[PDB]
Design a binder for this molecule. Structure first.
Ligand SMILES: COc1ccc(Br)cc1[C@@H](N)C(=O)Nc1cnccc1C
Ligand SMILES: COc1ccc(Br)cc1[C@@H](N)C(=O)Nc1cnccc1C
Lengths: 304, 304
């Protein structure tokens, strides 16, 4: 009973968080095995951020300039390199708390948990989605850079995001753990505006299935539709076009509830056209799009 | 930038979760020092739950009947006792992962994080509030009993909740860590309906302050009100009456934003009377009440 925006337990990730300082800049790092990963802008001054030449700024830095502290103990830096927009600091000690891990580059629409940190210390955990415009709507303040996003498959942590910056619009941009930005963003204090933030249709449908499972059924109607007809409506409302791949991914939820995917689409179509009329669905007055079909099945089945 | 429903990092609590089995019933336990705490209904069969005599059911149980497993290792039970609606299983090994902890009985309106578990394994973490009717709107399935709610003050974990049951209404009831239920609920499969779920006014105001801090200011108006006038409106909308204590707790947010508490009340009064007119506040289309004034300051200041 009940449906919440649930994050993965963060313990495995808390054991990897460190503080990295270079000059007067302090941010978070991720310590996995004998490498600490962090945003390369740790080498910048606030003056440098307008147009930094990272290769040139990095020439003036040695191993002893990167101060890495895991809790209250100092790690010895024996190597450093830049990979895309991240620095990799080789330390002389493997993190004894290193979980089983992978680095993944997620697709827009996929969700993940963020462990927001400041000065190497965890402050909170929340659930996110990579928006279709490759931004994330996070909760980050100055000093949160280097905080990571991840998913957990039983004992394996798949790191998918590292926080780098906030756009002047209040949304967030960052990289995968290879240092490649999601979207067109660059690690520079320049005019960067995000594209259209479209709604993740397959996630809204998954959340409608979660609502039916939990007893919120008022929006179910007597109608059906086709993918092409639904997509005419999805386009008008800045919703992602629904494909056969999305329908197939919703198959298990359709089977569990007995509500055909296209009938759920017709319910969604009427909700777009008429709104909620002051009603709520799973305690929300808007259509939620940050639960994937996998998230709904996981939460509705009790996977640990 | 940004404002999210953020939970505390769960690592310190994950290290305390164990599985407790008695007969054919398995649920979660909390292992702190050499004691495992769990709901007393672990001694019941599904037949017993209609009207259980816990003292009588417990007479037929010995230490060796409580199977406690921490991950994959078995804990040896050397004593058991019932305190209100919880069992305390004395084990021969202190949990090496026991954090600094306290047991607190929270007030309605206060928020906390829940680490939902099944079979002693964490599945997710989310943020809750103790409703004014003493229920929590959680996300729990069969096997989640014994999952706990907590707050963290730097290194100290204050456990405030242990999950015991779901009401036929889909909301949740449980106890503090002394085994006393929040509200009038009893651990019996009987007709238990929750009282009026009123809105936590002081939390809605705190969240309006969080919105102004983050740039969502459309709802600010040219009006002010008085506590008595505001409370006439709060009563009509099933909002908690606002007291001078609530105004005082909002003092730091009022000071940070320069918006007097009673002016924010007048903004809230117009939002109640007119609705949002299809607009959103911090990505919500309803007035959020599960952030306390302490939560807003913590999130808006970056406390770790
Ligand atoms: C002004 O700081 C930057 C400018 C450009 C870049 Br690349 C990076 C920063 C960085 N020092 C920072 O702290 N970023 C950030 C991210 N999320 C939330 C808040 C803030 C401010
Ligand atoms: C039917 O189970 C009970 C009846 C009464 C009581 Br006291 C306790 C239970 C318990 N066996 C249970 O699993 N509870 C529960 C809690 N949250 C979500 C889901 C469920 C079912």
């Amino acid at each position: 009973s009940g449906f919440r925006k649930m994050a993965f337990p963060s313990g495995k990730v808390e054991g990897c968080m460190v503080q990295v300082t270079c000059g007067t800049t302090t941010l978070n790092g991720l310590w996995l095995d004998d490498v600490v990963y962090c945003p390369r802008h740790v080498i910048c001054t606030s003056e440098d951020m307008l147009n930094p030449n990272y290769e040139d700024l990095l020439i003036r830095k040695s191993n002893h300039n990167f101060l890495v502290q895991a809790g209250n103990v100092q790690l010895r830096v024996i190597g450093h390199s830049m990979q895309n927009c991240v620095l990799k600091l080789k330390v002389d000690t493997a993190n004894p708390k290193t979980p089983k891990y992978k680095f993944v580059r997620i697709q827009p629409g996929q969700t993940f948990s963020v462990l927001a940190c400041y000065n190497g210390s965890p402050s909170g955990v929340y659930q996110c989605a990579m928006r279709p415009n490759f931004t994330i709507k996070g909760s980050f303040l100055n000093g949160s850079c280097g905080s990571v996003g991840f998913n957990i498959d039983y004992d394996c942590v798949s790191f998918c995001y590292m926080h780098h910056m906030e756009l002047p619009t209040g949304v967030h941009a960052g990289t995968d753990l290879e240092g490649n930005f999601y979207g067109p963003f660059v690690d520079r204090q320049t005019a960067q505006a995000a594209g259209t933030d479209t709604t993740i249709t397959v996630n809204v449908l998954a959340w409608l299935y979660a609502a039916v499972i939990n007893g919120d059924r008022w929006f179910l109607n007597r109608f059906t539709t086709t993918l092409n007809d639904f997509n005419l409506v999805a386009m008008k409302y800045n919703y992602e076009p629904l494909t056969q791949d999305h329908v197939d991914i919703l198959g298990p939820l359709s089977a569990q509830t007995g509500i055909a995917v296209l009938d759920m689409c017709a319910s969604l179509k009427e909700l777009l056209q008429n709104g909620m009329n002051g009603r709520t669905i799973l305690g929300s007055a808007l259509l939620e799009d940050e639960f994937t079909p996998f998230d709904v099945v996981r939460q509705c089945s009790g996977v640990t």
